[PDB]
């Protein structure tokens, strides 16, 4: 029992202690809804790879309708930027494809994009695999033209993991090493319903505290089917802060003495983006 109290205040005191050196963030769609990226919570085929292979046009039509007007990371994203800058961030595992972690200043070394990313796209032909930037992908999406490779005319696909596809190799190689030595799991904006990503919480040492910042309690073991234990008499390390990710991260920042630093960073970065 490393937390002195199963509260946000207890987690904050723990992170200010000598013992908390390596933080892993696990994040999902709830950390980007305040940036305008929608959380998506027969019709489920539009994100399954078998249908995409048969007809890619509805995915690219959907991508145009849901492309965000601007890429402005949230307070939550910039809280993770503070973790990196203060030397606490071991890794951010994200379920999100929206690139906002990168825009907030997390580097590829900092990130496991477990479900891929729109940041880059590739020709699907095994012998070609020409890479395309999001700028190029965006204009093909917005022209309502199915993106084709300029070298071989095969389909060009954003580097995202469709449902039914294997996760990237880097997800498994990082998780095998990272979770040996994690001092704190910050689980933000995910209800832990997507596998194998959700199983990450059970990979931490049993003594590692886990803070969930989310609209609902999640990750508890199902009564019919390493789960989160917030409320039992045996609960010893898991904390649930229930609300919007931005507000939860602002609350934790304030307890850490980072509130002014976080506000200044968000305002300056947002002003810079607004000016582009």
């Amino acid at each position: 029992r490393l937390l002195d109290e199963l509260t946000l205040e207890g987690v904050a005191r723990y992170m200010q202690s000598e013992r908390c050196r390596r933080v892993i963030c696990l994040v999902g769609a709830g950390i980007s809804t305040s940036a305008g990226i929608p959380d998506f919570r027969y019709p489920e085929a539009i994100f399954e790879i078998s249908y995409f292979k048969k007809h890619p046009e509805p995915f690219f039509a959907l991508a145009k309708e849901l492309y965000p007007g601007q890429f402005k990371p949230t307070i939550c994203h910039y809280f993770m930027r503070l973790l990196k800058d203060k030397g606490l961030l071991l890794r951010c595992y994200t379920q999100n494809i929206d690139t906002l972690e990168r825009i907030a200043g997390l580097e590829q070394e900092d990130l496991v994009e477990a479900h891929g990313t729109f940041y880059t796209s590739h020709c699907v032909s095994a012998s070609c695999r020409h890479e395309y930037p999001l700028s190029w992908m965006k204009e093909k999406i917005f022209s309502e033209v199915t993106p084709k490779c300029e070298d071989c005319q095969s389909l060009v696909k954003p580097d995202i993991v469709f449902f039914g596809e294997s996760l990237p190799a880097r997800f498994f190689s990082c998780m095998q090493s990272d979770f040996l030595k994690v001092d704190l799991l910050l689980v933000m904006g995910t209800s832990l319903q997507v596998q194998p990503f959700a199983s990450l919480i059970s990979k931490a040492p049993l003594s590692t505290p886990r803070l969930l910042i989310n609209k609902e309690k999640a990750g508890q073991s199902d009564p019919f089917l390493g789960g989160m234990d917030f409320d039992s008499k045996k609960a010893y390390r898991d904390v649930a802060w229930l609300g919007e990710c931005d507000q939860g991260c602002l609350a934790l920042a304030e307890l850490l003495g980072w509130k002014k630093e976080l506000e200044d960073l968000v305002r300056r970065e947002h002003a810079s983006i607004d000016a582009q």
């Binding site: 489920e44 479900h115 993991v161 469709f162 449902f163 039914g164 596809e165 294997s166 996760l167 319903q193 997507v194 596998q195 194998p196």
Partner: peptide, 5 residues
């Protein structure tokens, strides 16, 4: 293994 809901 694969991305599963």
């Amino acid at each position: 293994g694969a991305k599963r809901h």
